[PDB]
Design a protein around this ligand. Structure first.
Ligand SMILES: [Zn+2]
Ligand SMILES: [Zn+2]
Lengths: 162, 157
């Protein structure tokens, strides 16, 4: 009378849990494949916000790895008169990012967009047909991902050396 | 190599959304009906751990409401000697209770059981075939303590 009884909940419920376990199977093997590419050197890996960003901007990323714990936004700012601009990543916490003055012409800067980092990197991934994988902060692999590698890694299609 | 590109996920994950959509309307069905009973009869609903357990024990609960945000443990200490026994409830946090000695014979009391409140009340509800609903809504967890019941009849309990 107030909750399912025909047992479709239990059915739909069933598949759902199995799929999750498939997820973590994919998330594990993926971190591991990043590791296996890293060890074998190759120069076919990359990790950290700055290093992984530049590869995405040249479509070199085969597989993109992001921790389920990434708490950080990318802030773009632009000068209201001259062509000055800058971007940078700030860890989000409870107001909003500010815009001071132009170090070029002294005019007031203004923030033109804020985007969580996981957004920007998925937009670029999608762009270059990179595969997008997420990694919960549970299994050690997915833990180290955030601990060491800034919670952003990647297996590359080729060695940019970058 | 790392995901479900069969479309299977998309469907089930989505079907799991449609059915969660529904389960929630139902939980509003149940809380609304409890409050309506409370309004034509203050004796045909129950609320609170005390009145509700008393009513389930006597199989007079038509429908039972349990707040998902309920952290509590029912302790049972018996005397290792005389037939003494008590039952108290303890709000949940990160330990396990101890008994001490007996007010009757002075022997050692032992905690013979700890059972999740939701568990006991559930078993209690399975023997009378009462319909069990978990509510998260928060007017339950707060205004009444996350335990409430729509009786099948007025019990004076
Ligand atoms: Zn300027
Ligand atoms: Zn005793």
């Amino acid at each position: 009378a107030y909750t399912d009884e025909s047992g479709l909940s239990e059915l739909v419920n069933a598949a759902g849990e199995k799929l999750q376990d498939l997820e973590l199977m994919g998330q594990k093997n993926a971190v591991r494949d990043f590791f296996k590419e890293l060890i074998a050197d190759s120069g076919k890996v990359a990790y950290g916000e700055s290093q992984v960003r530049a590869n995405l901007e040249i479509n070199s990323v085969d597989v993109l790895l992001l921790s389920e714990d990434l708490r950080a936004e990318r802030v773009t700012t632009k000068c209201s008169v001259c062509g000055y601009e800058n971007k940078w990543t700030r860890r989000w916490k409870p107001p909003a990012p500010a815009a001071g003055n132009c170090p070029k012409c002294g005019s007031s800067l203004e923030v033109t967009d804020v985007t969580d980092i996981v957004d920007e990197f998925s937009e670029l991934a999608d762009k270059s047909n990179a595969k997008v994988v997420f990694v919960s902060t549970d299994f050690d692999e997915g833990s180290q991902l955030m601990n060491a590698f800034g919670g952003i890694a990647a297996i590359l299609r080729y060695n940019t050396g970058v």
